[PDB]
Amino acid sequence: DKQDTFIAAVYEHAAILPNATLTPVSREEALALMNRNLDILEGAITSAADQGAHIIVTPEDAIYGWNFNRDSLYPYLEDIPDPEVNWIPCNNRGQTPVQERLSCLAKNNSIYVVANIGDKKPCDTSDPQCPPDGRYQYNTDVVFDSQGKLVARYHKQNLFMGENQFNVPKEPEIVTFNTTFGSFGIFTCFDILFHDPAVTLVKDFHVDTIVFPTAWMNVLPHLSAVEFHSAWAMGMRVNFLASNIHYPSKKMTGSGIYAPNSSRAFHYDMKTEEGKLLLSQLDSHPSHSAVVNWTSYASSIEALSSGNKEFKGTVFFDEFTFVKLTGVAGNYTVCQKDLCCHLSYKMSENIPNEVYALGAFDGLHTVEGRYYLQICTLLKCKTTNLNTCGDSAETASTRFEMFSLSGTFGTQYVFPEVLLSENQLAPGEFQVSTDGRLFSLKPTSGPVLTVTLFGRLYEKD
Ligand SMILES: *[C@@H]1O[C@H](CO)[C@@H](O[C@@H]2O[C@H](CO)[C@@H](O)[C@H](O)[C@H]2NC(C)=O)[C@H](O)[C@H]1NC(C)=O
Ligand SMILES: *[C@@H]1O[C@H](CO)[C@@H](O)[C@H](O)[C@H]1NC(C)=O
Ligand SMILES: *[C@@H]1O[C@H](CO)[C@@H](O)[C@H](O)[C@H]1NC(C)=O
Ligand SMILES: *[C@@H]1O[C@H](CO)[C@@H](O)[C@H](O)[C@H]1NC(C)=O
Ligand SMILES: *[C@H]1O[C@H](CO)[C@@H](O)[C@H](O)[C@H]1NC(C)=O
């Protein structure tokens, strides 16, 4: 009974956290908490369904929060079976009340629900990987169809540092589920930065859409949630439904609905403590650019400047090679090892006290994650001191008339980011060519913070 379009929802949830204790709570108390969160999510699910939604994603850790060790978490966990068990928790019919409730919300509102809860998998002592305390504990995405049937279960593969209360699956779980409105894949938060499963789902299973529960700490200039999540969508050419936690206190905010060509809806709010429901109609099999050769253009030309005054700047603990942008227009090129970044630009006007720089990085990131990068970035320097180029910067005043950025990337996996002052996306104000140029389509609707090509060489990790 296939459909050409569908309405997506994502909910940015202000989580109710458990009270702290020095000793593990009872299963009855842990449920109490989870139900209070569930009461809220029910609000979002009811509303979204009442607005035509076919699926809704809720965030990671949205039901019990993120402050845990292995034991304090345990009473919140449930044993979550393989969808292949072929089971509708609402109907049948106890020891899995969270799953029952989720299944009922999906059924009573006739809507796919996607949530993050915790799975426990008690293991045998024969299993050499079995933890001393007798069980695996996984961070677990679950999906329920509009019948309430469990159709997907993904265990998070790439844990962030601090997630000591969870285990890493022995093997990467490549999890999909199909619908009348397309083929979906799923992964969680920090997974987006790695090859398994996120890349494989797209490259090898050809999913139309990704659902993506998350709790994401915003790190400028390149990893604000909305900024990076939408760029991934665009780079991998998929619909992308990012449901983030709302917790400004920890720089967590940035949910949205992204299509290959543009953001469709986004929310970023650091000023209040209320959550947010987003909606947008999408195409089941979404329209996208044909395959991009990212090095094609940048390798066909000679350097746009030389005798450069280059310098080192620290962008998120990585040492880039920069060059100041002097004119109100200009063309520059900057290299580092195998990467050459080419920028042509023209500003709307020169804001006197705002410096921009074009930067190149080719190397291994190591802080709070070990992964290999290649990056071209135009960015606004925090201050007029060039030692601050690469440091986090909230706001700007310099609009741009045009830009065109490209690099000699040795990866086919590059993600085009653009971010405007006050952490605003620039939907449909740019596009990517077949040969790897990221170029403006018009004058920017606001001041620019960065325009970046975020490359990623998964093998060199
Ligand atoms: C619906 O999704 C299923 C996955 O359940 C798709 O089947 C996979 O297709 C990929 C890519 O063609 C194959 O490499 C896999 O072998 C298939 N599944 C598995 C589990 O390995 C199916 O193509 C989708 N339905 C369509 C296109 O109508
Ligand atoms: C949901 O559906 C079940 C089906 O039996 C119904 O009995 C229950 O009262 C409903 N609960 C909610 C929260 O809608
Ligand atoms: C991209 O273009 C370059 C020439 O600029 C070529 O050598 C390279 O093989 C191309 N890559 C692909 C995947 O077509
Ligand atoms: C470089 O920029 C100048 C203006 O600064 C422009 O006229 C020229 O055509 C550009 N060359 C390119 C993009 O190769
Ligand atoms: C935690 O929960 C109890 C009720 O279960 C509430 O009355 C109390 O105020 C809360 N504790 C703190 C420190 O806020």
In the residue annotation, 104 being an active-site residue is answered as no
Q: In 366-437, at which residue ranges do the beta strands (DSSP E only) sit?
A: 371-380, 400-407, 414-420, 430-432
Neighbours of 86 (CB within 10 A): 10
Cα dihedral 291, 294, 298, 300 in deg (nearest 10): -50
Tell me how far CA of residue 340 lies from CA of 87, 308, 373, 378, 380, in angstroms. Answer: 54, 13, 13, 13, 19
Q: Work out the widest C-alpha separation in the chain, in whole angstroms.
A: 74
Q: Give the integer Cα–Cα distance in Å for 386 and 383.
A: 7
3-state DSSP helix/strand/coil % of the chain, to nearest 5: 20, 35, 45
- For residue 382, the 8-state DSSP code is S
Distance 443 CA to ligand 3 centre (A): 31
Question: Which of 461, 59, 387, 449 lies closest to 242, judged by CA?
Answer: 59
Ligand nearest to the CA of 21: 5
For residue 48, the surrounding DSSP H or E stretch is helix 27-49
**Tokens 């999890």, residue?**
175
Q: Give the integer Cα–Cα distance in Å for 147 and 107.
A: 5
For a mutational test of ligand 3's pocket, the pick from 203, 291, 293, i.e. the residue with the most ligand atoms closer than 8 A to its C-beta, is: 293
**Tokens 């009855």, residue?**
28
Parse the chain into domains and list their residue ranges.
1-290, 291-461
Domain 1-290: give its CATH superfamily: Carbon-nitrogen hydrolase (3.60.110.10)
Tell me how far CA of residue 147 lies from CA of 88, 111, 448, in angstroms. Answer: 8, 8, 45
User: Is any atom of ligand 3 closer than 6 Å to the C-beta of 296?
Assistant: yes
For the chain, report the end-to-end CA distance as a whole number of angstroms. 43
Q: Check if the beta carbon of residue 214 is closer than 8 Å to that of residue 243.
A: yes
Lining residues, ligand 1, CB within 6 Å: 176, 178, 183, 205-206
Which residues lie closer than 8 Å to 295 by C-beta, 6 or more apart?
Answer: 407, 408, 409, 410, 436
Total count of residues recorded for the chain: 461
Q: Which amino acid is at 83?
A: P
Q: Check if the beta carbon of residue 412 is closer than 8 Å to that of residue 405.
A: no
Q: Give the integer Cα–Cα distance in Å for 83 and 265.
A: 31
In the residue annotation, 189 being an active-site residue is answered as yes
Task: Give pairs for 431-434: CB < 8 Å, separation 24+.
Answer: 431/261, 431/289, 432/234, 432/289, 432/292, 433/292, 433/297, 434/289, 434/290, 434/291, 434/292, 434/293, 434/296
Structure-solving method: X-ray
Distance 435 CA to ligand 3 centre (A): 9
Cα dihedral 301, 303, 305, 306 in deg (nearest 10): -150
Q: Give the integer Cα–Cα distance in Å for 268 and 423.
A: 7
Which residues lie closer than 8 Å to 243 by C-beta, 6 or more apart?
Answer: 10, 11, 12, 13, 57, 58, 59, 60, 62, 114, 211, 212, 213, 214, 255
SS3 153: strand
For a mutational test of ligand 1's pocket, the pick from 151, 177, 183, i.e. the residue with the most ligand atoms closer than 8 A to its C-beta, is: 183
Q: Check if the beta carbon of residue 102 is closer than 8 Å to that of residue 141.
A: no
Q: Give the integer Cα–Cα distance in Å for 416 and 429.
A: 12
For a mutational test of ligand 2's pocket, the pick from 47, 98, 104, i.e. the residue with the most ligand atoms closer than 8 A to its C-beta, is: 104
Ligand nearest to the CA of 93: 2
Question: Choosing from 104, 189, 341, 381, which is the catalytic residue?
Answer: 189
Q: Check if the beta carbon of residue 286 is closer than 8 Å to that of residue 238.
A: yes
Q: Give the integer Cα–Cα distance in Å for 150 and 380.
A: 47
Question: Which of 80, 239, 96, 220 lies closest to 152, judged by CA?
Answer: 80
Distance 111 CA to ligand 2 centre (A): 14
Q: In 180-316, at which residue ranges do the beta strands (DSSP E only) sit?
A: 182-186, 209-213, 239-243, 255-258, 263-267, 276-283, 310-315
